[PDB]
Design a protein around this ligand. Structure first.
Ligand SMILES: ClCCOc1ccccc1
Length: 162
């Protein structure tokens, strides 16, 4: 298991434009296209992302290319964020994957406001962290996914993904 395999499980793979759990146009392995309700707007973003006229369909290779970029960007975002970086640096590699997973899903601004959870993670109070993480819109809207990510933070193992 690793961050790629982990997010592949959490996000799925769809080769045509679909709506994500929030109702936003998305493609590939959870590549958010736009928060706009316009399908045409989404197709424009898709074409710009891939570099050709796709008419809303991409290949698996193209999906994996965006996915790699998205993971890279999430990591790079964490490292450029003054609140996230020290917590990330403090973690082992398995818990780092859980951190990336959350940023991938909710964006770095969103996760940077998990102030109390971030502190518990830095402190390595894993059970406390796991309790605090669940007290969130995130947990309530995507409980099965949140439960997997929380278990990963709590245990530093891949148990929730085997
Ligand atoms: Cl507090 C739940 C998120 O934990 C993170 C820790 C480090 C970087 C990004 C996220």
């Amino acid at each position: 298991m690793n961050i790629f395999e982990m997010l592949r499980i959490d996000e799925g793979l769809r080769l045509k434009i679909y709506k994500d759990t929030e109702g936003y146009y998305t493609i590939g392995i959870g590549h958010l296209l736009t928060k706009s309700p316009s399908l045409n707007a989404a197709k424009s973003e898709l074409d710009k992302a891939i570099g050709r006229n796709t008419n809303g369909v991409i290949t698996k290779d193209e999906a994996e290319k965006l996915f790699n970029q998205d993971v890279d960007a999430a990591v790079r975002g964490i490292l450029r964020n003054a609140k996230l970086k020290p917590v990330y640096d403090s973690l082992d590699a398995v818990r780092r994957a859980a951190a990336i997973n959350m940023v991938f899903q909710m964006g770095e601004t969103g996760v940077a406001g998990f102030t109390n959870s971030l502190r518990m993670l830095q402190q390595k109070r894993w059970d406390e962290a796991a309790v605090n993480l669940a007290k969130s819109r995130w947990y309530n809207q995507t409980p099965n996914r949140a439960k997997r990510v929380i278990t990963t933070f709590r245990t530093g193992t891949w148990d929730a993904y085997k």
